[PDB]
Ligand binder design. Structure first.
Ligand SMILES: [Mg+2]
Length: 561
């Protein structure tokens, strides 16, 4: 049973297996009840690897612990073996965070990896499942490759598999499989889920300083909520065991196949338990992660919310608290276009390039590969650096802890100081979910026509007393300086002379309108007011100029962040 046979299985192609930018995601039920659905897709991935290069290739494999993960990993082993892939490196119990996969790929020079995650989407018998493909730079497979995978998947007629091959995912070390009538063996290395990632962080951060910060009587008190997802053992082994945080610091840090029956998506309501804990006033710092660990929410004492747009700005403004950046220097900053302009204030002051990209990883990855990007952020709870090629939630937490250690102030005092220094970008995102597509499309088309008129620049909007003047209005376009691609229709931007912006996007069962409001204030009498009060005038202007209520019938957003 260490010696196994290779067989060819006739199959019937499916027509909807698009790998997308974040992976193929379907209901678990779909993978289970659709004959050869997973097999087809995994074969299609492996078929993108040239036969001549398969024996010397390694794929990194692991996922976020959700229901069906281990069955999918076994299936990946069976098919990779049969196809002549020489080696898989698999996290113990199948567990690898998305940042750990990126880490390991780059460390061992793997050709890529397959990540079993659907990120922040629910899991369990009635939940979702996802299959994500990363390539040799440790980042998401780009469109040319996902296109090829899709094309193969649509006409596949057979796949190769070792049906009797079974991996013990629970035990560390090398397992070898001899394939019938194949000269070279198939090798699986089970590795500790945390070690490589922790060794990376140990080099990036000053663990001595952090241990001192987190240990003993005068310690910074923290609560870190992995939301029953993949980052749990990382918190326990790094923050608690290595850096000495009391075990109670690790909240929901046992991976559960259904993430405890909840969505592992960090925000004020999905992580309401963490927020309520922080409200007691006993802890200095709180954070929550999404299911696969590339998203993070940051909280201060009393449940003070650091919005993600501000978070990346504060990290930029204190970036040399982190040993990694002392060594590399700061190669550049970037944020997605709908993210608030807080980062740009820091970049301008420190005279570092600011790249404003369309939504999507590929734009950050390109700039990092060009040695032009050290720190990036997205308003959707995303923060990262060029240490790897995925965003990294726990990395962002250790960045914050490093800054707290050097500043010796509370989270809230650091933000107040920041706002006083740079001005404040009040920020919110309104989501209108499942709106009728016809109305939403008409809303966008009509608004863009309005904005394109010659007289629209210079138009004034009263608040009142306060007057907003349109400086620039367009449909965002981006020419990538690395791959030369031009991305068009990336969002309607109303840019005002006082540094403020309104941005409209349609999401990529009914459309989702995303409305981003970025209101800049410099006045001391304004920067510490209530955010929804300070944002109300631009929100009003946004709804009036777009006629959103009139076009969609919505009097209120579905979600406010
Ligand atoms: Mg994620």
């Amino acid at each position: 049973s260490n010696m196994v046979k290779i067989v060819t299985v006739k199959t019937q192609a499916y027509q909807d297996q698009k790998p997308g930018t974040s992976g193929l995601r379907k209901r678990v039920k779909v993978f289970q009840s659709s004959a050869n659905y997973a097999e087809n897709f995994i074969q299609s991935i492996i078929s993108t690897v040239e036969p001549a290069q398969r024996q010397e290739a390694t794929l990194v494999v692991g996922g976020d612990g959700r229901f069906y993960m281990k069955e999918a990993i076994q299936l990946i082993a069976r098919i990779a073996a049969a196809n002549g892939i020489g080696r898989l490196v698999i996290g113990q119990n199948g567990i690898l965070s998305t940042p750990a996969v990126s880490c390991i790929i780059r460390k061992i020079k793997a050709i890529g990896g397959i990540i079993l995650t659907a990120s922040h989407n629910p899991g369990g018998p009635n939940g979702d499942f996802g299959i994500k493909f990363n390539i040799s730079n440790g980042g998401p497979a780009p469109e040319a490759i996902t296109d090829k995978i899709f094309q193969i998947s649509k006409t596949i007629e057979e796949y190769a598999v070792c049906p009797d091959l079974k991996v013990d995912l629970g035990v560390l070390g090398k397992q070898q499989f001899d394939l019938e009538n194949k000269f070279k063996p198939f090798t699986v290395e089970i590795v500790d889920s945390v070690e490589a990632y922790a060794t990376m962080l140990r080099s990036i951060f000053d663990f001595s300083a952090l241990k001192e910060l987190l240990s003993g009587p005068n310690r910074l008190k923290i609560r870190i909520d992995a939301m029953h997802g993949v980052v749990g053992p990382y918190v326990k082994k790094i923050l608690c065991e290595e850096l000495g945080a009391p075990a109670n610091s690790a909240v929901n840090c046992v991976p559960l196949e259904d993430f405890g029956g909840h969505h592992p998506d960090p925000n004020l309501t999905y992580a309401a338990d963490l927020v309520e804990t922080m409200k007691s006033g006993e802890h200095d710092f709180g954070a929550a992660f999404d299911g696969d660990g590339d998203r993070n929410m940051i909280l201060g004492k009393h449940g003070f919310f650091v919005n993600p747009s501000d978070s990346v700005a504060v990290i930029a403004a204190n970036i040399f608290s982190i040993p990694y950046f002392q060594q590399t220097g700061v190669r550049g900053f970037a944020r997605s276009m709908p993210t608030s302009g807080a980062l740009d204030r820091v970049a301008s002051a420190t005279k570092i390039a600011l790249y404003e990209t369309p939504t999507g990883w590929k734009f950050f990855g390109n700039l990092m590969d060009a040695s032009k990007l050290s720190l990036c952020g997205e308003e959707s709870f995303g923060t990262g650096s060029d240490h790897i090629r995925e965003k990294d939630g726990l990395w962002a937490v250790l960045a914050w802890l490093s800054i707290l250690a050097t500043r010796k102030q509370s989270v809230e005092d650091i933000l107040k100081d920041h706002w006083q220094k740079y001005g404040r970008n009040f920020f919110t995102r309104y989501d209108y979910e499942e709106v009728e597509a016809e109305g939403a499309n008409k809303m966008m088309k009509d608004l863009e026509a309005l904005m394109f008129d010659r007289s629209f620049v210079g138009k004034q909007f009263s608040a009142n007393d306060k007057v907003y003047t349109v400086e620039k209005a367009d449909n965002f376009e981006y020419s990538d300086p690395v791959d030369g691609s031009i991305s068009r229709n990336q969002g309607l931007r109303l840019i005002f002379t006082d540094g403020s912006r309104i941005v409209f996007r349609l999401s990529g069962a009914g459309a989702t309108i995303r409305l981003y409001i970025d209101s800049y204030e410099k006045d001391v009498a304004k920067i510490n007011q209530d955010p929804q009060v300070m944002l109300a005038p631009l929100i009003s202007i946004a709804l009036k100029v777009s006629q959103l209520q009139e076009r969609t019938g919505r009097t209120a957003p579905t979600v406010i962040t």
